[PDB]
């Protein structure tokens, strides 16, 4: 009944859709590829500032922060999109952070095979999460889990990163056991959906690489700069 304190603080740090819908803005017919690209780039910037405000992450050195964010940027973008579909919008349409809704018909007719496949599998994951009744507390907790999903070996500060991982998983478990009276083990099935999200985000990386080899993306697209970090 009592939600863990970790989740309470993460909720307090979650910027409600209002404000970065606002700021992303101001910054039928064929789909505007380039402005959708810049929209994804602004989404990534808002996610990086969210991370900057987070617990534990705020105490690490910039190198460890860079390592962590380099390991999960695509995953966090995809998860933000999926939770945007869960929380709002219809299953005949996809909602984008600007508030625009794109119907799956438009995707099927305009998109290539791989983007189409990716949107479809994202909708599959959305349905999965709806069936397990994913809620905002779980969303922020899973975001925090993804952020620290990197193995300790690649980081200088093992102690704090591992404390964060442990406490995040404990918070999720405690919350699911106390608020989810149904059967299934929501903890484990949420974690396996995170597995699926990471796979989908790898596919998204492949899509962006395909666009880059064809020189179809804007010149200074930030997702392409992250893709090439090595």
């Amino acid at each position: 009944p009592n939600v863990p304190e970790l989740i309470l603080q993460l909720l307090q740090l979650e910027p409600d859709e209002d404000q970065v819908r606002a700021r992303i803005l101001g910054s039928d017919q064929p789909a505007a590829f380039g402005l959708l690209c810049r929209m994804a780039d602004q989404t990534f910037i808002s996610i990086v500032d969210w991370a900057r405000r987070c617990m534990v992450f705020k105490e690490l050195e910039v190198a460890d922060q860079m390592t962590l964010l380099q390991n999960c940027w695509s995953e966090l973008l995809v998860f933000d999109h999926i939770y945007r579909q869960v929380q709002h919008g219809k299953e005949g349409s996809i909602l984008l952070v600007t508030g625009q809704e794109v119907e799956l018909t438009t995707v099927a007719t305009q998109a290539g095979s791989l983007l189409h496949s990716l949107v479809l599998r994202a909708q599959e994951l959305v349905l999965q999460l709806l069936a397990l009744q994913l809620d905002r507390q779980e969303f922020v907790c899973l975001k925090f889990i993804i952020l620290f999903s990197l193995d300790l070996k690649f980081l200088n500060n093992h102690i704090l990163v591992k404390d964060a991982q442990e406490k995040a998983n404990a918070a999720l478990l405690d919350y699911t056991l106390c608020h989810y009276p149904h059967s299934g083990d929501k903890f484990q099935q949420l974690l396996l959906c995170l597995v699926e999200v990471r796979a989908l985000s790898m596919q998204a990386k492949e899509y962006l690489y395909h666009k880059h080899l064809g020189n179809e993306m804007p010149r200074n697209n930030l997702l392409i700069e992250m893709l090439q970090a090595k």
């Binding site: 910037i45 990086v48 500032d49 900057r52 910039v62 922060q65 860079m66 964010l69 380099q70 930030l222 700069e225 992250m226 970090a229």
Partner: peptide, 12 residues
Amino acid sequence: ENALLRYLLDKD
């Protein structure tokens, strides 16, 4: 290193 990440972590 990733200059873009250093940028968005350092400010703006």
